[PDB]
Amino acid sequence: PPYTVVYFPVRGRCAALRMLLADQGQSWKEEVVTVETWQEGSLKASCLYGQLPKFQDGDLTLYQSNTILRHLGRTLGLYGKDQQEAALVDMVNDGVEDLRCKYISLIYTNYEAGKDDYVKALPGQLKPFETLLSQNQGGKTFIVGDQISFADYNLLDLLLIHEVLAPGCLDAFPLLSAYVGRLSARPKLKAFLASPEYVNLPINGNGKQ
Amino acid sequence: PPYTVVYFPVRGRCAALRMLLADQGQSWKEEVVTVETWQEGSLKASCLYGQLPKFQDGDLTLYQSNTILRHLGRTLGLYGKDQQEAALVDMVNDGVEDLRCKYISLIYTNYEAGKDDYVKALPGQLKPFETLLSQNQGGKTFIVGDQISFADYNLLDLLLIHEVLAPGCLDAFPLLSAYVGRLSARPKLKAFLASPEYVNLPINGNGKQ
Numbered sequence: 125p126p127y128t129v130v131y132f133p134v135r136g137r138c139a140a141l142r143m144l145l146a147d148q149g150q151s152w153k154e155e156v157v158t159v160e161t162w163q164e165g166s167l168k169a170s171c172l173y174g175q176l177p178k179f180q181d182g183d184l185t186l187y188q189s190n191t192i193l194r195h196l197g198r199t200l201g202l203y204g205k206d207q208q209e210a211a212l213v214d215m216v217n218d219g220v221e222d223l224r225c226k227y228i229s230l231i232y233t234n235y236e237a238g239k240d241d242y243v244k245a246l247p248g249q250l251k252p253f254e255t256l257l258s259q260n261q262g263g264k265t266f267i268v269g270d271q272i273s274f275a276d277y278n279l280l281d282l283l284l285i286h287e288v289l290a291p292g293c294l295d296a297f298p299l300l301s302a303y304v305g306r307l308s309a310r311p312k313l314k315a316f317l318a319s320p321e322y323v324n325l326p327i328n329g330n331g332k333q
Numbered sequence: 334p335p336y337t338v339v340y341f342p343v344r345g346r347c348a349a350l351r352m353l354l355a356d357q358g359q360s361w362k363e364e365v366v367t368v369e370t371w372q373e374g375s376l377k378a379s380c381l382y383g384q385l386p387k388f389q390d391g392d393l394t395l396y397q398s399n400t401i402l403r404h405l406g407r408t409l410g411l412y413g414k415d416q417q418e419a420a421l422v423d424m425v426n427d428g429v430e431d432l433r434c435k436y437i438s439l440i441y442t443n444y445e446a447g448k449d450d451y452v453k454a455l456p457g458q459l460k461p462f463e464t465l466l467s468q469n470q471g472g473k474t475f476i477v478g479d480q481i482s483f484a485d486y487n488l489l490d491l492l493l494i495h496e497v498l499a500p501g502c503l504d505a506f507p508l509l510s511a512y513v514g515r516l517s518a519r520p521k522l523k524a525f526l527a528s529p530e531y532v533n534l535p536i537n538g539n540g541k542q
């Protein structure tokens with residue numbers, strides 16, 4: 125176990141990277157931080173931007189969930205076959221991040237009064253991803269190219285958490301639906317998604333989803 | 334190359350990539366999109382995520398400002414000397430992006446009532462960058478390593494727009510102050526920042542800054 129993930133006991137911004145590690149057959153150590161430990165102050169005080177996750181790869185300490193993903197994509201060969209693909213992978217990931225931010229604000233700042241709006245606008249937000257798939261070998265493979273990239277794990281998590289928020293939201297999108305099923309069927313990932321370490325963790329830190 | 338930048342006639346999310354292109358001796362064509370043109374709908378409907386900027390590098394069309402920056406970073410040698418530096422460059426850029434997002438929400442949604450609170454919390458938001466500089470050879474050169482990266486351009490823009498929003502905000506940060514002074518003095522960058530094509534564009538589209 126050369127990697128260490130320091131985070132709160134929630135899926136949140138660490139779910140995609142955990143899926144990547146699990147699917148890639150990589151070993152890691154989870155350093156769980158409880159709300160109490162956080163409230164004490166010291167740890168937050170040591171974090172670059174005062175937030176988690178924190179990640180250790182040997183002697184290298186990183187912060188920022190997308191920085192961690194790009195790092196693993198870079199060192200594990202999950203960043204496209206060439207520079208042209210690397211750019212498309214980034215483009216996809218940034219799009220995922222944008223929607224993730226909107227999702228986070230809903231959950232933490234206006235879940236009750238904003239849900240219906242969010243849900244009605246959701247299909248307009250998902251359409252771009254359906255488009256990218258239709259444009260890459262008829263959506264029969266990955267989001268970019270013929271190989272899995274760190275953007276697939278991030279997109280998959282986004283899709284999964286949206287199905288929980290708005291059941292059947294992928295029904296109008298044939299390629300996204302098939303994509304989720306296909307990736308979810310990968311043996312190592314399938315086992316992980318069914319394990320207690322994933323299943324018994326809440327999606328968000330406030331219990332809403 | 335060559336490159337085509339498609340954006341509204343404002344600095345905004347295109348300022349950093351323009352500074353990079355100018356300073357690194359690149360040439361690009363600016364395709365200005367007027368609000369009247371945007372509101373008509375044809376171009377927007379064509380944009381992957383329904384938003385600008387759009388960037389062309391031959392037949393490679395990209396969207397997402399940070400994707401454009403990383404693309405230029407890896408093709409122009411502005412992404413660190415190795416994998417560890419690349420990770421650090423990403424960490425800095427994601428931090429800049431987080432703060433830029435807060436700045437944009439302030440500008441577009443709560444300028445009048447939220448400015449004071451924002452400014453009061455600004456020192457805490459800038460401290461991590463002052464810290465990063467101190468950890469890199471006492472902050473005598475660049476944000477990461479001893480050669481310029483795309484993160485330097487993005488960070489420079491963030492600091493420039495904050496000095497306009499809150500005059501004197503960098504006075505408390507000696508390393509960040511000196512850093513902005515060094516970078517602004519770079520010949521090509523200096524000339525660009527003094528030119529009409531930069532100076533005569535508003536920072537943000539809604540006329541607030």
Ligand SMILES: N[C@@H](CCC(=O)N[C@@H](CS)C(=O)NCC(=O)O)C(=O)O
Nearest residue numbers: 136137174175176177188189190431
């Ligand atoms: N851009 C950062 C954001 C990290 C973040 O928002 N962390 C939250 C949890 S999702 C946190 O640490 N909150 C604790 C605090 O702000 O005190 C990333 O993507 O890693």
Ligand SMILES: N[C@@H](CCC(=O)N[C@@H](CS)C(=O)NCC(=O)O)C(=O)O
Nearest residue numbers: 222345346383384385386397398399
């Ligand atoms: N994550 C995108 C955000 C782009 C963005 O916010 N674009 C705005 C202008 S700054 C836009 O195109 N607004 C027009 C619209 O949404 O209709 C990026 O970083 O490029």
